[PDB]
């Protein structure tokens with residue numbers, strides 16, 4: 545009934561070019577079994593969307609990586625957000641939603657935009673730059689840690705900790721083993737910055753700690769909620785911005801459209817998130833026997849959702865492998881779907897929008913002028929290096 549495949553979606557060969565194997569996973573059937581890791585897989589949009597939107601059956605509190613927290617110890621204390629189910633998830637989620645609210649975005653937008661414009665101006669003085677280290681990485685590093693309220697010292701641990709968290713969702717392969725081996729200095733930095741005295745007034749971290757008296761969270765939960773905002777989002781935003789620059793370089797007709805109407809900036813970034821899907825996969829664990837795509841899945845089974853594949857499923861998308869900055873992107877699952885849908889999505893979209901706006905107004909051409917290098921991670925997709933020449937408008 546259920547097809548069994550030997551594809552390892554966490555292998556370096558797969559990461560190097562996942563798209564043929566993602567088609568094989570989709571076309572084999574609505575539900576597959578991955579013999580390499582003894583998990584179920586869903587790679588089409590329909591089943592991925594269904595699983596995300598049924599959290600009672602496909603829970604998160606047994607872990608959203610390969611490891612089942614009912615069988616193994618989590619590598620770190622469980623997130624109060626990502627690794628919780630309703631109702632325990634609900635009020636901590638509401639706090640993070642209010643910390644990263646539309647009102648907060650209105651407070652920080654002008655500064656985020658000015659820093660994007662300044663970065664592009666600076667890069668145009670150099671001409672030939674690395675669009676990852678110098679742009680996709682440098683810009684979020686120039687706005688998000690400050691908006692968090694982090695001190696200057698130690699910020700070099702942020703992206704390593706981000707990569708560690710994402711690697712630790714994966715199976716016990718070399719990427720995961722090496723990440724955990726290197727983890728201690730990054731973990732020690734992150735956990736210390738989560739304490740209230742270390743978060744500057746008015747920033748995201750201070751606002752979490754100020755939200756500890758409403759009956760939604762307690763003071764002893766605020767450190768782990770700050771940890772969520774230091775564990776998630778930064779590398780994804782970097783990878784999304786880097787993918788946008790890569791697409792604007794490889795599809796120059798789309799840069800020409802963006803230049804002609806800079807108000808396409810927000811959707812140009814949203815399309816890059818669909819196209820690249822910085823988070824490629826997430827797991828759920830079944831809490832009961834369930835029918836999914838004609839398959840009967842027992843209790844306590846891990847289900848691997850292919851977000852990137854769902855965002856390129858031709859059953860749902862026209863020309864899914866094309867970068868189209870006017871595509872109707874609504875419904876893509878690059879940020880998830882349902883009750884866990886990325887609580888930081890407004891921050892990521894703000895950063896991506898204002899960077900692409902700066903490019904749209906200031907840059908006439910983006911030409912790849914050096915070897916492109918991929919960064920490997922068990923669950924994140926993104927480039928390591930993207931040498932480009934920027935021509936000013």
Ligand code: HEM
Pocket residue numbers: 604608625626627637640772773776777778780781784817821822823826877878879880881883884885886887888889891892
């Ligand atoms: C392009 C950028 C981003 C992408 C692709 C992305 C991806 C995702 C996805 C797919 C989920 C769903 C997790 C699940 O269903 O189990 C998620 C949740 C989450 N993200 Fe993001 N994210 C991004 C940016 C951010 C940012 C900027 C932040 C913080 C400021 C952030 C913090 C979080 C948190 C805390 C959660 C957990 C939400 C919950 O479980 O209710 N993310 N993200």
Ligand SMILES: C=Cc1ccc(C(=O)O)cc1
Pocket residue numbers: 623624625626627709771772773775776777823
């Ligand atoms: C989507 C990635 C992600 C990683 C960590 C956390 C967390 O630590 O709460 C949330 C989301």
Ligand SMILES: [Cl-]
Pocket residue numbers: 620731
């Ligand atoms: Cl940790």
